[PDB]
C-alpha cells in the first residue's frame, strides 16, 4: 500500500494517471495505492466542420489562448470543436467534437508526466483548467491531484506545435526553429537547433579538437 512505481522505475501518487501505450493502443493508467489499473482511452470523435471530420489537433491555439480538449469557446450553440492545426488563426480549419474528454499531460514539474487533474484545488480554489496563477512566468501549469495545496504535486502544461518551447541549459526560453550557438575558441563549437516534439526537444551539431 502506496504510490506506484512503473517497470521503468517511474514513481507516481496514488490518485495520479498518466499514459501508456500497449502495443497499437493508448492506455490510461491510474495509482490504485493497491497497485495500477489502466484503460483504452478513447479517442474523440469528429464530425462535420469546414474540416469535414478531420482529427483534432491538441492542443491548439484559438483566441490567443490554448485548448487542451474541444471547446464550445466562442460557439453560441454551446457545440463542441477543436482546430484541426495547432493554429487555428494562420490556418483556419475545424470540426465538431461528439464527447469532451480531456487528457492532459503535463511536462517537467515534480509528477513524472502525469495528466492534469481536473479539478485541482489551489488557493482554496477549483481550477478547471491549467493556470499560470502564482506564476510571474507566465507558464500555464495544472495540479496532478484533486487538491494542490496538500499535495503540491504539479505539472507544466503543454503548448500548440507551433508554440512549443526549448529551454537552455542556463534556462533561457527558445522558439521552435530558433538555433542556439555556442563559441568555444572555434576548437570546439556547437550549434543547437529547438525541435521541440513536446518535450522540449534540441537537435545539436558540434565539432571536437
Ligand atoms: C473543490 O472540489 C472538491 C472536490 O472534492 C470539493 O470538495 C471542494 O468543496 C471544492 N472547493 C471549492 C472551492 O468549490
Redesign the pocket.
Same mark, same amino acid.
Given at each position: 500500500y502506496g504510490d506506484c512505481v512503473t517497470d521503468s522505475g517511474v514513481v507516481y501518487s496514488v490518485g495520479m494517471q498518466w499514459l501508456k501505450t500497449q502495443g497499437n493502443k493508448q492506455m490510461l493508467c491510474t495509482c490504485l495505492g493497491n497497485g495500477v489499473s489502466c484503460q483504452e482511452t478513447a479517442v474523440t470523435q469528429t464530425y462535420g466542420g469546414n474540416s469535414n471530420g478531420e482529427p483534432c489537433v491538441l492542443p491548439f491555439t484559438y483566441n490567443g489562448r490554448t485548448f487542451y480538449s474541444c471547446t464550445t469557446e466562442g460557439r453560441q450553440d454551446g457545440h463542441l470543436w477543436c482546430s484541426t492545426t495547432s493554429n487555428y488563426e494562420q490556418d483556419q480549419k475545424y470540426s465538431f467534437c461528439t464527447d469532451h474528454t480531456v487528457l492532459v499531460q503535463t511536462r517537467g514539474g515534480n509528477s513524472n508526466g502525469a495528466l492534469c487533474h481536473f479539478?485541482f484545488?489551489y488557493n &482554496?480554489? &477549483?481550477y478547471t483548467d491549467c493556470t499560470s496563477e502564482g506564476r510571474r512566468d507566465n507558464m500555464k501549469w495544472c495540479g496532478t491531484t484533486?487538491n494542490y495545496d496538500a499535495d503540491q504535486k504539479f505539472g507544466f502544461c503543454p503548448m500548440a506545435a507551433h508554440e512549443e518551447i526549448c529551454t537552455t541549459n542556463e534556462g533561457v526560453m527558445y522558439r521552435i526553429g530558433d538555433q542556439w550557438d555556442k563559441q568555444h575558441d572555434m576548437g570546439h563549437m556547437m550549434r543547437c537547433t529547438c525541435v521541440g516534439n513536446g518535450r522540449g526537444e534540441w537537435t545539436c551539431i558540434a565539432y571536437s579538437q
Open positions: 479539478p484545488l &482554496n480554489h &477549483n484533486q
